[PDB]
Amino acid sequence: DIDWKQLRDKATQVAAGAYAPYSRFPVGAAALVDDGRVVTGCNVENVSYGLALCAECGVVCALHATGGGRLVALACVDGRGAPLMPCGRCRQLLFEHGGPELLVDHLAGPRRLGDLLPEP
Amino acid sequence: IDWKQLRDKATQVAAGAYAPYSRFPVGAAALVDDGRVVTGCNVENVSYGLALCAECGVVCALHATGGGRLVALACVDGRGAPLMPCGRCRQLLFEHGGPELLVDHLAGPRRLGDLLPEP
Amino acid sequence: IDWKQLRDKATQVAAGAYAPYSRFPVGAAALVDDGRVVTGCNVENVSYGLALCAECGVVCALHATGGGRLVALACVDGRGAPLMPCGRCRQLLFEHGGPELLVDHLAGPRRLGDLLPEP
Amino acid sequence: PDIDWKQLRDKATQVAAGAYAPYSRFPVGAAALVDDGRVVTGCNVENVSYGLALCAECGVVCALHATGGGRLVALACVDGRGAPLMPCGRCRQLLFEHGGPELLVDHLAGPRRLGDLLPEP
Ligand SMILES: [Zn+2]
Ligand SMILES: [Zn+2]
Ligand SMILES: [Zn+2]
Ligand SMILES: [Zn+2]
């Protein structure tokens, strides 16, 4: 059963590792895997902008580097801990590993990935 | 640099590879200038252009575990052979490793500065 | 909005598709707000993460031909059936078309705003 | 074809004026000679999600295939002031697929082979 406060705290903590000197907008993310472990990532920008990696990219990389599984929940936050909605690219990434019932943290209550990326 | 340890770690992480479209798993391990080792494996996607290389995982893990500069990288395929990073990954690595980063290669490691001239 | 013309131009351009890795060719055509039509096809790469969707070609062509906003898009597969853009491409299109951009679909076109909510 | 470097730079310079780069403010234009003689062009297109940015060379490669394919023979990439630029690593890998090691890239001293810009690809 999803501990949203754990996920947000983890996403806020990992945001400190963000490499975002171009945007000056650090982002952290934390996701609950179906075995119950949490994987994290932070954004990593590049001088060639189109090589930039979103925090959710880090999450999916760590998912598999730590043995795989399915994503159940995700929190993405700015430096100040405000929830953020994944970009379109990240919605497609996350859909591969979590499907439509993956929950994404949002101030009003979580959103299902299926609603954030219809007709996947 | 402990090349055997980096190769061992890259081989270990390659078992987690998510590569059902290419069926070409890859594992990568890098030494950070503070002594720690960070790892990644490739993660493909039905939209091919969203695929992440093992090296993208290494760079993500570098920063999620507190940043630093990369000193040495070993990438390995499923046969156990060293793999040269693709161009995208060379550019990625250059940002965090510069030209003196060493990449595992048969016979002896190569400098990233030679792999990506005029960066 | 001549959906027939957009679909035929998308089918035409799809014959130029470079998709030897997936064997899944895609063509796309978009009406720009000044009435002209810009096109693209998919272009894959041995490094899968470097693959370009047809819609990336549309967006590149939009700007290389002087810019504008996108009004309507048709994407087609090998059978000439409409395809929904991947999420990356939805974000791409949103930058240049916003929520009212129409995307061809069986039975009737869909708004980008519904395909990519909370943009 | 005989490579007309002047044509390729002029064409890259022209297309650079259409670059969509409101996040970096670093516009880039590119023009490539295809093996059938035609020139294809591209400019960079950035995105609010930085990692969705497309390089001028991505435009070049999309245009190549939208216009019937072939192999790239020469490329000129220019900044907003018309000065030559070297493609980024991603773009070297892209271009390698469509031009191989003998693709020439414009550079102030004289062109460079992609083979030298991307060894052991
Ligand atoms: Zn994203
Ligand atoms: Zn790579
Ligand atoms: Zn796409
Ligand atoms: Zn590039």
Automatic annotation (TrEMBL), chains B, C:
Gene Ontology molecular function, alphabetical: cytidine deaminase activity; zinc ion binding
Q: Report the PROSITE patterns cross-referenced here.
A: CYT_DCMP_DEAMINASES_2
Does the record's keyword annotation contain Membrane?
no
The GO annotation for biological process reads:
nucleobase-containing small molecule metabolic process; pyrimidine-containing compound metabolic process
Q: Where does Zn(2+) bind?
A: C53, E55, C86, C89
Q: Which UniProt keywords apply?
A: Metal-binding, Zinc
Q: Does the keyword Zinc apply?
A: yes
Q: Which GO terms describe its cellular component?
A: cytosol
InterPro entries to which the protein is assigned, alphabetical: CMP_dCMP_dom, Cyt/Deoxycyt_deaminase, Cytidine_deaminase-like
Domain CMP/dCMP-type deaminase residue range list: 1-119
Record's family?
Answer: Belongs to the cytidine and deoxycytidylate deaminase family.
Q: What is this protein called?
A: Cytidine deaminase Cdd
From TrEMBL, chain D:
Q: Which GO molecular function annotation, any one, does this entry have?
A: zinc ion binding
Keyword Zinc belongs to the record: yes
Q: Name one GO cellular component term.
A: cytosol
The record's annotation in InterPro entries points to: CMP_dCMP_dom, Cyt/Deoxycyt_deaminase, Cytidine_deaminase-like
Occurrences of domain CMP/dCMP-type deaminase (ranges): 3-121
Q: Where are the transmembrane segments?
A: none
What residues does Zn(2+) bind to? C55, E57, C88, C91
The UniProt entry's GO biological process terms, in alphabetical order, are:
nucleobase-containing small molecule metabolic process; pyrimidine-containing compound metabolic process
| Keyword annotations | Metal-binding, Zinc
Q: Which family does it belong to?
A: Belongs to the cytidine and deoxycytidylate deaminase family.
* NCBIfam families attached to this UniProt entry: PRK05578.1
Provide the protein name. Answer: Cytidine deaminase Cdd
